[PDB]
Amino acid sequence: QIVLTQSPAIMSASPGEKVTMTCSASSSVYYMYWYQQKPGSSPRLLIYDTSNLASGVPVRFSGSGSGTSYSLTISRMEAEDAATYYCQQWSSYPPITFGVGTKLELKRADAAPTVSIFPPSSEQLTSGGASVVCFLNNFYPKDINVKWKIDGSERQNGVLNSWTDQDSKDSTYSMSSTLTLTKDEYERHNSYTCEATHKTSTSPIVKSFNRNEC
Amino acid sequence: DVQLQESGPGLVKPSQSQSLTCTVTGYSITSDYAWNWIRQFPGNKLEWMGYMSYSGSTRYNPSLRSRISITRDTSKNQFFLQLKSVTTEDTATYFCARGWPLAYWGQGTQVSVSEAKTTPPSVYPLAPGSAAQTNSMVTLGCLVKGYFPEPVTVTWNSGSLSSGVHTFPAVLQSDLYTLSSSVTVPSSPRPSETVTCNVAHPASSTKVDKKIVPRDC
Ligand SMILES: CC1(C)CC(Nc2cc(NCCN)c([N+](=O)[O-])cc2[N+](=O)[O-])CC(C)(C)N1[O-]
DSSP states (O other): OOOEEEEOSEEEEOTTOOEEEEEEESSOOSEEEEEEEOTTSOOEEEEETTTEEOTTOOTTEEEEEETTEEEEEESSOOGGGOEEEEEEEESSSSOOOBOOOEEEEEOOOOBOOEEEEEOOOHHHHTTTEEEEEEEEEEEBSSOEEEEEEETTEEEOTTEEEEEOOSOTTTOOEEEEEEEEEEHHHHTTOOEEEEEEEETTEEEEEEEEEESSOO | OOEEEEEOOSEEOTTSOEEEEEEEESSOTTSSOEEEEEEEOSSSOEEEEEEEETTSOEEEOTTTTTTEEEEEETTTTEEEEEEOSOOGGGOEEEEEEEESSOOOBOOOEEEEEOSOOOOOOEEEEEOOOOOOOOOSEEEEEEEEEEESSSOOEEEEGGGTBOTTEEEEEEEESSSSEEEEEEEEEESTTTTTSOEEEEEEETTTTEEEEEEEOOOOO
């Protein structure tokens, strides 16, 4: 039953800056708890009973809240605090519920995507498949488009993109675009071009391999 | 320090019943506290499932109260979650945790509910197809495709090469996953200094090393 809605949903702050995120209960709650979670790690307790700090928790963190409206504040955001923050409630057993997290990301200078394209390995072709991979690496902001052209025309079927979350050390995003084909389809075309467009340049970065190579 | 470690079967067939075991270290499950089982769905959603009070009593989430059952073994300091008739929708990662307030969580175990089958990964090298002027840096990589289930673990030059690496998040190819990793080395150490990708797949007990060599000519 009792719903927890959080604000903001994705938040980009710079190190040294002040941070405040909100968690609203749809109905009044006895206390609120706040958790921190990094990709792969389990949830860590931060603030318990609305405003109490947990044991391993730096005093840059701080919880607030009257009935139904609560908030976790990071006074000066550190780079290590880049993570997703959940609120969770205790009221009269609905049961205990959790928000869906507010995502805290780190701010940095616009970076331009290093585009690369790879033809399928001889080994891959032997199985009857042929994938064409395009690594759009190390860019900021995360907003990109990738266009695929097999022999001049624009394709949309067979493309699979995966994105990495913000890099551990330089704070940038990277994304692999893979076009999958079958050996025979692949061998009735000659230009495979991977075309990326990102905020840091109106003209796209087009990397093109052509099936007459070496 | 109190210590919570869940575990149990990683792959489960629809309509069968899963059983996870949480084993706790450093504090007895009979002297104070409520012992919880909480699960985290893909994306982010945490769900409370139920708890065992130190005295024996259980409390469960009202939606899952027909389907799940929590139990214990005080001689082995263990409490268990049993999931009856599992649907696709129970695919998630299950954490046990020390109750009220929820400090002390287990590291998390993944349960995959699928009719699919433990296939090992095919790993193919990715090397430059000539292309054009770009820079003083080589990007190469590995296409780890065709496996079930998650995870595989990709490393470059046995862990020697940790900078410049980008292992991309897996995606379901055709109800088996494809995943890929990129490493960007200086053009001077290539190919004088050998780069190689080491893939590993726990479920199928597979390790495959794969040397990236300049291609074709
Ligand atoms: C133990 C502690 C410090 C944490 C409690 N937290 C708690 C306490 C309880 N039950 C208290 C029993 N009336 C439950 N519960 O039953 O789900 C949940 C929670 N929780 O989610 O944090 C809140 C109070 C102020 C009662 N206390 O005393």
